[PDB]
Design a protein around this ligand. Structure first.
Ligand SMILES: OC[C@H]1O[C@H](O[C@H]2[C@H](O)[C@@H](O)[C@@H](O)O[C@@H]2CO)[C@H](O)[C@@H](O)[C@@H]1O
Ligand SMILES: OC[C@H]1O[C@H](O[C@H]2[C@H](O)[C@@H](O)[C@@H](O)O[C@@H]2CO)[C@H](O)[C@@H](O)[C@@H]1O
Ligand SMILES: OC[C@H]1O[C@H](O[C@H]2[C@H](O)[C@@H](O)[C@@H](O)O[C@@H]2CO)[C@H](O)[C@@H](O)[C@@H]1O
Ligand SMILES: [Ca+2]
Ligand SMILES: [Ca+2]
Length: 686
């Protein structure tokens, strides 16, 4: 199959994701609606169940609403079983309508539907070329009170109907009993509870194994992707070990939520995206898009900088999921605002690098403050709006113009209010002009592009006041006036003669796993795939087409590799980097070193004998380790993903900048568990 096929569970870059709050979309089956006090069929009370379900979704798929828009993937609420208690939060009654209050990850939330409902969901979707994504929220269970066990469901956790345990009398230590986080530090928000939610302890093997098993079911259920909740609140290492579980089994595109505020740029965030095994919701993109197009607290120069920066910061920028709003922010559209802004931001998003996500109702111009005001019921399924039409015209380009899906981004023209950018991939080009100024047109002269000589009609057909463009030789455009609030898309497509890799997934796996290589110009005859200098040909290459190749990772040493491909003629492609070859299956192991005192600005790190531990390369040591919560300085700790059942030699180090100090003595040693977790505790050797 081609890269664009619905069967591509590894690449979403050519897709357009439609984010749905199940409960708030469409009540296809009233029979499964909660009753009594948990229910409000008028959906006036935004904290109760309104009745939205899977059947409703299926109906919307079948009646052309989503397909009509050009949407090719839907992202739905966490489908596992939620607690049934109604929680009164100081007068206000609250239900688990959101799906974030898990009780059993092996069962469905019956308000949404049955396993059978879910299966039909996957079927209808698939039938219409739509991929399915779910929210998965393994950080916690539900709201608990350790000394008020009668509160809610005490954060109880079941394994397919079997009671594993509760928040009160947690002798098994399923949960954390460290208090509530003040979000003050990263360590702090990982090992404490989030508000009153029962924090799962991933270091407890039961918990560990349980979630790894739970996700496999859903995987087996046919899901196309995972959206991880609160990744900034779980252990990094655990999460990676979790990723390996998915990839080593049945890989699917996974992306996590790691909130960024305005003007926030976190290096922790980049590292996680680059090394975890998953990608993230592009908060940096969102925040900036809003500042520029919505709040007007930043200009084009600001957008441009986000674009160039993020391309540098993320090893796989094309894997970040962009959006203009979601369930955690106010709805982009403000009641009294010019709709053009929302239209422009959509256009921008749809034509920019990443995996675009559309918050349900956007195309309907829904307004609404923060939770739960941004979660109202979709008021109508009209395809007549301008936003509906914009998506309709643009979404499909991601499938037909790889410049949009995989191309680089380049600023061609810029001022405070205007932004002209080029997307390029192979023989494909896309040119987008945006004029944020809703009151002033702009004189555009000097625009130079990669488009072939000729005239180009606005892909939006002038819907947002775009115009035609005239490209002379040398790709220089002749002067034109860009309308106030103007938006235009111009493009050029053509066959790519040379093999060009546009994407790879998964990005981390053990040998023997099949990965997917997307792009163009691979030709029809099997060529060769290189992993570093290692050549792979013949049988291990399970499939080869012009746009997609499927190959098994060779049994090479755990490490980071560069991928490249050669066609049957020996022509090589561009390199795709940062691919991680796991040492084998992984386990999450907690390392603890005692009495590792440091000076200010000096941190302890971990290194060792496997690629998972950086192979003795200080520049690749794990850390800095933690020293507040679970263990107190001068005792440091850290949760790490390691090859399972392997005997590993390790050492700790103190780093300051790039200056390193090694632990004295001989290597510490240990053997990783075959499964579940473990805790190694040692003393720093001077
Ligand atoms: O001429 C090529 C030139 O085009 C763009 O420069 C624009 C500039 O952004 C506008 O603000 C205005 O000054 O017109 C210039 C064209 O004369 C590119 O931004 C620039 O890098 C490139 O050299
Ligand atoms: O919270 C982690 C913190 O640990 C390290 O600082 C030590 C410092 O070296 C000691 O002299 C002592 O005063 O306690 C500190 C930990 O609270 C790192 O130096 C620091 O950058 C890091 O954040
Ligand atoms: O370079 C690989 C080498 O790294 C580590 O050796 C350290 C040693 O432990 C330190 O005390 C200090 O002398 O720096 C050496 C770095 O060359 C591992 O201990 C060793 O096994 C490994 O081969
Ligand atoms: Ca229902
Ligand atoms: Ca946590």
């Amino acid at each position: 199959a081609p890269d664009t096929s619905v069967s591509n569970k590894q690449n979403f870059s050519t897709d357009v994701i439609y984010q749905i709050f199940t409960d708030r979309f469409s009540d296809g089956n009233p029979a499964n609606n909660p009753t009594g006090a948990a229910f409000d069929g008028t959906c006036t009370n935004l904290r109760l169940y309104c009745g939205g379900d899977w059947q409703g979704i299926i109906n919307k798929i079948n009646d052309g609403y989503l397909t009509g828009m050009g949407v090719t993937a839907i992202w739905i609420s966490q489908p596992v079983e939620n607690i049934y208690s109604i929680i009164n939060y100081s007068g206000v009654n609250n239900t688990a309508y959101h799906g974030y209050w898990a009780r059993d990850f092996k069962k469905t939330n019956p308000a949404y539907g049955t396993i059978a409902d879910f299966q039909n969901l996957i079927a209808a979707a698939h039938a219409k070329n739509i991929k399915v994504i779910i929210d998965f929220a393994p950080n916690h269970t539900s709201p608990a009170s350790s000394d008020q066990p009668s509160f809610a469901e005490n954060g109880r956790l079941y394994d397919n109907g079997t009671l594993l345990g509760g928040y009160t009398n947690d002798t098994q230590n399923l949960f954390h009993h460290n208090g509530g986080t003040d979000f003050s530090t990263t360590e702090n928000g990982i090992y404490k509870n989030l508000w009153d939610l029962a924090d799962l302890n991933h270091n407890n093997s039961t918990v560990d194994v349980y979630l790894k098993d739970a996700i496999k079911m859903w995987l087996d259920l046919g899901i196309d992707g995972i959206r991880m909740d609160a990744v900034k609140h779980m252990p990094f290492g655990w999460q990676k070990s979790f990723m390996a579980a998915v990839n080593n089994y049945k890989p699917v595109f996974t992306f996590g939520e790691w909130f960024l505020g305005v003007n926030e740029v976190s290096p922790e965030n980049h590292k996680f995206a680059n090394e975890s095994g998953m990608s993230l919701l592009d908060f940096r993109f969102a925040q900036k898009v809003r500042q520029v197009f919505r709040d007007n607290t930043d200009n084009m120069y600001g957008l441009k900088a986000m674009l160039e920066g993020s391309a540098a910061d993320y090893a796989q920028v094309d894997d970040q999921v962009t959006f203009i709003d979601n369930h955690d922010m106010e709805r982009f559209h403000a009641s009294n605002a010019n709709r053009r802004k929302l239209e422009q931001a959509l256009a921008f998003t749809l034509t920019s690098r990443g995996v675009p996500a559309i918050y349900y109702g956007t195309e309907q111009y829904m307004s609404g403050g923060t939770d739960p005001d941004n979660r109202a019921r979709i008021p109508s399924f009209s395809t007549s709006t301008t936003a509906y039409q914009v998506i309709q015209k643009l979404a499909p380009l991601r499938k037909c113009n790889p410049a949009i899906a995989y191309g680089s981004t380049q600023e061609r023209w810029i001022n405070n209010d205007v932004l002209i950018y080029e997307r390029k991939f192979g023989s494909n080009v896309a040119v987008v002009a945006v004029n944020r100024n809703l009151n002033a047109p702009a004189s555009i002269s000097g625009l130079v592009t990669s488009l072939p000589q000729g005239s180009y009609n606005d892909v939006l057909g002038g819907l947002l006041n775009g115009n035609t463009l005239s490209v002379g030789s040398g790709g220089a455009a002749s002067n034109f006036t860009l309308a106030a609030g103007g938006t235009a898309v111009w493009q050029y497509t053509a066959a790519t003669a040379t093999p060009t890799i546009g994407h790879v997934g998964p990005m981390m796996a053990k040998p023997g796993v099949t990965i997917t290589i997307d792009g163009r110009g691979f030709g029809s005859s099997k060529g060769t795939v290189y992993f570093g200098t290692t050549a792979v040909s013949g049988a291990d290459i399970t499939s080869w087409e012009d746009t997609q190749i499927k190959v098994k990772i060779p049994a090479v040493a755990g490490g980071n590799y560069n991928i490249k491909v050669a066609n049957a003629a020996g022509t090589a492609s561009n390199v795709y980097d940062n691919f991680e070859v796991l040492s084998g299956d992984q386990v999450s192991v907690r390392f603890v070193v005692n009495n590792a005192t440091t000076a200010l600005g000096q941190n302890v790190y971990l290194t060792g004998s496997v690629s998972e531990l950086g192979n003795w390369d200080p520049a690749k040591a794990i850390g800095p380790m933690y020293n507040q919560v679970v263990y107190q300085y001068p005792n440091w700790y850290y949760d790490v993903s390691v090859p399972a059942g392997k005997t590993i030699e390790f050492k700790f180090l103190k780093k300051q900048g790039s200056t390193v100090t090694w632990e004295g003595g001989s290597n510490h040693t240990f053997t990783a568990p075959s499964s579940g977790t473990a805790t190694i505790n040692v003393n720093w050797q001077p």
